[PDB]
UniProtKB/Swiss-Prot annotation:
Record site: Involved in the binding of some activators, including histamine and L-histidine: 90
Species this protein is from: Homo sapiens
BP-aspect Gene Ontology terms: angiotensin-activated signaling pathway; carbon dioxide transport; morphogenesis of an epithelium; neuron cellular homeostasis; positive regulation of cellular pH reduction; positive regulation of dipeptide transmembrane transport; positive regulation of synaptic transmission, GABAergic; regulation of chloride transport
Annotated phenotype, changing residue 60 to A: Reduced activity
Cofactor binding, per record: Zinc. Can also use cobalt(II) with lower efficiency, but not copper(II), nickel(II) and manganese(II).
Alphabetic keyword roster: Acetylation, Cell membrane, Cytoplasm, Disease variant, Lyase, Membrane, Metal-binding, Osteopetrosis, Phosphoprotein, Zinc
The UniProt record lists the keyword Phosphoprotein: yes
Name of the protein: Carbonic anhydrase 2
Length: 258
C-alpha cells in the first residue's frame, strides 16, 4: 500500500513503487572517515539565516516539517561545494525508538540518536518542484544529534509537538530561528546523493556536519510520542523513520577539513 517504515511497507519495499531506490546515487551512506578525501579547494559554508521567516509546523505522516517562507532570499545557504544560492524551504528530523539508532548517515558505522535535515532549493530553478528534477537542485545540511545536555534552541519545537500529534495536523509556528540548531563548527563532508524518502530523486548535494549537537533524553522522548497514523486511527508511534545506508557505488566523499 503506501510507503512508510513498517515491516510491510518499509525501506526494503520502496523499489517496487520507486525503482530509483536501487539507483547509482542513493542516500544516506556510511561516512568512512579514513577514505574521505580532504579537498582544500572546497570553500567554507555560508549560512545566512538572520532573516529566516518560519510559518508552520506539520505532521505529514512520516516526520514533522517546520516550513519557511521561501518567496525571497531570506534564509539561504551558499559557498561550500555549491554554485549559486539555495533557499531554505523546511527542516525535519529522523529519529529512532532507542538512543542507539535514529540517524540516516553513519560515521565509521556509528549511528546517532537522530539527524536534522535543513532542506534548500537552487534558486536558478524558480521553485522547489522544478529543483527536484535537476542534478544540482537541492542542498541538504545534515546535523547529527547525540543525547547529553539539552539544546535550548530546540525547546520551542519540542513544546508544540503535542498539538500536531497525528498525520495531517499543523500549527502556526512563527518567529523560530534555526540558528539555535547549529553546532559551533561548520566543518563538513560532502557527496552527491538523493532524497532519503520517496520519491528518492537523485537531486541532492549533501552537506553533513562533522560536529553533532547535543539534545537531552527528555527532548528526544517527546519526538517518540508523535504518531504515524491520522486522528481516530489505531496508534502507531512515529519512531525509526530512518533509511539504512546505501551503497556508495561510484562516489567520492570529500572533506572540508583534515
Ligand atoms: Zn530527511
Amino acid at each position: 500500500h503506501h510507503w512508510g517504515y513498517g515491516k510491510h511497507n518499509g525501506p526494503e519495499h520502496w523499489h517496487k513503487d520507486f525503482p530509483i531506490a536501487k539507483g547509482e546515487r542513493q542516500s544516506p551512506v556510511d561516512i568512512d572517515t579514513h577514505t574521505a578525501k580532504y579537498d582544500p579547494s572546497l570553500k567554507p559554508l555560508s549560512v545566512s539565516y538572520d532573516q529566516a521567516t518560519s510559518l508552520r509546523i506539520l505532521n505529514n505522516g512520516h516526520a514533522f516539517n517546520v516550513e519557511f517562507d521561501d518567496s525571497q532570499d531570506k534564509a539561504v545557504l551558499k559557498g561550500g561545494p555549491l554554485d549559486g544560492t539555495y533557499r531554505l524551504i523546511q527542516f525535519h528530523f529522523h529519529w529512532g525508538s532507542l538512543d542507539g539508532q535514529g540517524s540516516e548517515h553513519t560515521v565509521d558505522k556509528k549511528k546517532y540518536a537522530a539527524e536534522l535535515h535543513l532542506v534548500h532549493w537552487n534558486t536558478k530553478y524558480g521553485d522547489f518542484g522544478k529543483a527536484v528534477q535537476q542534478p544540482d537542485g537541492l542542498a541538504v545540511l545534515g546535523i547529527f544529534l547525540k543525547v547529553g545536555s539539552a539544546k535550548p534552541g530546540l525547546q520551542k519545537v519540542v513544546d508544540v509537538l503535542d498539538s500536531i500529534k497525528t498525520k495531517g495536523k499543523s500549527a502556526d509556528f512563527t518567529n523560530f530561528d534555526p540558528r539555535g540548531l547549529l553546532p559551533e563548527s561548520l566543518d563538513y563532508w560532502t557527496y552527491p546523493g538523493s532524497l532519503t524518502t520517496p520519491p528518492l530523486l537523485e537531486c541532492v548535494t549533501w552537506i553533513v556536519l562533522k560536529e553533532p549537537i547535543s539534545v537531552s533524553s527528555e527532548q528526544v522522548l517527546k519526538f517518540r510520542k508523535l504518531n504515524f497514523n491520522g486522528e481516530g486511527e489505531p496508534e502507531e508511534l512515529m519512531v525509526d523513520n530512518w533509511r539504512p545506508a546505501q551503497p556508495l557505488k561510484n562516489r567520492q566523499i570529500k572533506a572540508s577539513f583534515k
